[model samples]
Target: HHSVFEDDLPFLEFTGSIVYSYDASDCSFLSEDISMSLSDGDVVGFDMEWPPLYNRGKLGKVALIQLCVSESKCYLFHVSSMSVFPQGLKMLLENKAVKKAGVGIEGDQWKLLRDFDIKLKNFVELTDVANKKLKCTETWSLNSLVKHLLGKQLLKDKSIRCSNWSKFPLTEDQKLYAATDAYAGFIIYRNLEILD
Candidate 1:
């Protein structure tokens, strides 16, 4: 019953309510839907995506953001839709109490600040933890870590990785890919706890 975390790390698809709104104006939406469970000190699975600019846009013009609040559900915000981030969403993300867990967190933070003007806070770099606490010598991607921990293969679609994320209605496959990325982070974080 808990999408928050599980032993088997069941394959999760995030069809949860698409309440994160996007418009031409302030790009701000009420964080209530997501804020419902994201209380102080919650470790959210965070990830972001943008069209591979190759030689065009800035480093972090994220078209969408995936946040895993629980195991069964996650939120995908159309970051490109808003000219600026919503105040509530920004505050929630900046809350030091709520930690974010994922791989490449340092890179993610730098990119967000440099381009998106969004500064992430209070995050644990899972890769570092794996090396130090779990006694692992190699770094693990979401796909490899999930496979190692739960014996499941996460979606690592190259086409979607380079897809047009700025497009108005995202494809079903895109949604699942984004959600799986974030959900797997939570799974890894939870699994690492057992090792501790």
Candidate 2:
């Protein structure tokens, strides 16, 4: 179970909790209830974490899903717990009408399909696209790009490197850390428009 008073973790700052009571008799309805909040034209930035190494022909489950909008509203998306996987969300994710933005999105796509049977399309990867557009001789990790282009420092600590994201009731700090990534992405998009 997740608690606010867990071991001090940097990512806990971005955590938010939503408890859902699922009735097995109405699983489909429950899925719809959960998905109704999603809307078209909702541009989102997404990130995730999973096991890095896997045996050949096997894939690890996605442990976390961090998402945010340009307005700085963030969500943890809690994929590991939900009975109905993010298939409905994936439709929105793959919709050509909505443009998703992120850094290193290919890995996210791979993990989504591997873990949740969701294939993503119509997304913009800032790191790859920026490299092509800027043609700069520099690194392009999320931290690097933010620092180089926006002069923002992104904290990268391995303290939560092996966090049990499957736990419910995430810590406050974890939520904040997750939220910051999306919020920072929004800031970076704003900076890009000005710089371009």
Candidate 3:
């Protein structure tokens, strides 16, 4: 039988509009769009994806970056396709007032710095935040934290999770998956922020 967790638990969903930025121009517009949708102090959900190597080959570049500010908005920047990393994005990533939150965010920051020479600031690690706020010893994954706090399960299909993220014009499933992951981070952090 298929796993009950996959079959029974409701998939965490992001009903937001997923904006795509495939090139520098699109990325420029993305900055403006972000400004309108999110403020300086807002916490954006953040995640990154790259084409996975099956064997022990060299690591690939980070192909896609996901950011979500709210249920109504998220952005997918296909940096692999962009001729230049947009300056505006770099500024935002480094902005101290704009915090990005996600599970295991330090590694993502390291990777971005290594690959693109861009430094990230004010990125919050969700697991640390959860553990501190809840005053618990247990570690938290994005999925587990969502289940524990929101009572929802994320869709974590291997086919999708391990798919080639470097491809341009990501598949609909990929978009939804990427969007939801980032959105989940935003939601989980927000929920944690309000607890007594």
Candidate 4:
């Protein structure tokens, strides 16, 4: 996404959840549609994860996907039980004109493409941008950046870390965690804009 003023950019957060049909097939959730206002926004941020990582090469099967907009509306996608992933999402991911921003996005991108066959474009790496613009010497984890830039601490719960996202109805804590991840991007983007 192009931005005349960094502060004016839109941020998106997406959370994906597991869905199980009556027949016991696995699926993921996606929003039926996005508002025209969002489709026309300047930028969007997104994130996804299945279970917490236990090994370097092993990624938790993706359960939840989160997309957040700077407008403060967030869409949490449940992917496990859905009949099909939303077409709106495929459009967003493939739209060259829309820039996607996030930390550690390449891994997510790989998972999305491999599992869902969605190819993404116009991505902005928040950690890379932060290192370049903010000149921070620390590692570029999203949690680290959020704490450093926003002075907020995020919970890192191991019990729920690897919970089955594709299993069923989501827990409240899981939902909050997913939503906050996207919301934090909005905060980080604003801070980076000011620094720029």
- The prediction achieving the highest lDDT against the true structure is 3
Runs of candidate 3 with Cα error greater than 4 angstroms are 1-8, 54-58
Regions of model 1 farther than 4 Å from truth: 1-20, 23-30, 55-60
Q: Mind giving the per-residue lDDT tens digits that candidate 4 earns over 90-187?
A: 77677776667788888778888877898977777788878877976556878777766765555666666456666667787666667767667656
TM-score of each: 0.81, 0.69, 0.91, 0.74
lDDT digits (tens) for residues 57-117 of candidate 2: 6645775666565453555566656666655455555666555677878877877777777
Model 1 lDDT tens row, 1-196: 7563454544544555433446523323445556666677778788888876653535536788777877777777777777666676776677787788899988888877776576788988888777776786996777667767777776545888779887877787877788778887877887786675
lDDT string for model 3 (1-196, tens) is: 7876555567898887999878887787787778677676889999989888743554677888899878688899888888899887887788887899999899999989988999989999999989888989787899999888877889889899888999888999999999999999988889888877
What global local distance difference test value does model 1 have?
0.72
Q: Report the alpha-carbon TM-score of model 1 versus the true structure.
A: 0.81
On a 0 to 100 scale, what is the lDDT of residue 125 in model 3?
Answer: 96
Q: Which segments of model 2 are wrong by more than 4 Å?
A: 1-42, 51-59, 132-137
Winner on lDDT between 2 and 3 is 3
TM-score of 2: 0.69
For model 3, the run of ten residues with the poorest summed lDDT: 52-61
Best by TM-score: 3
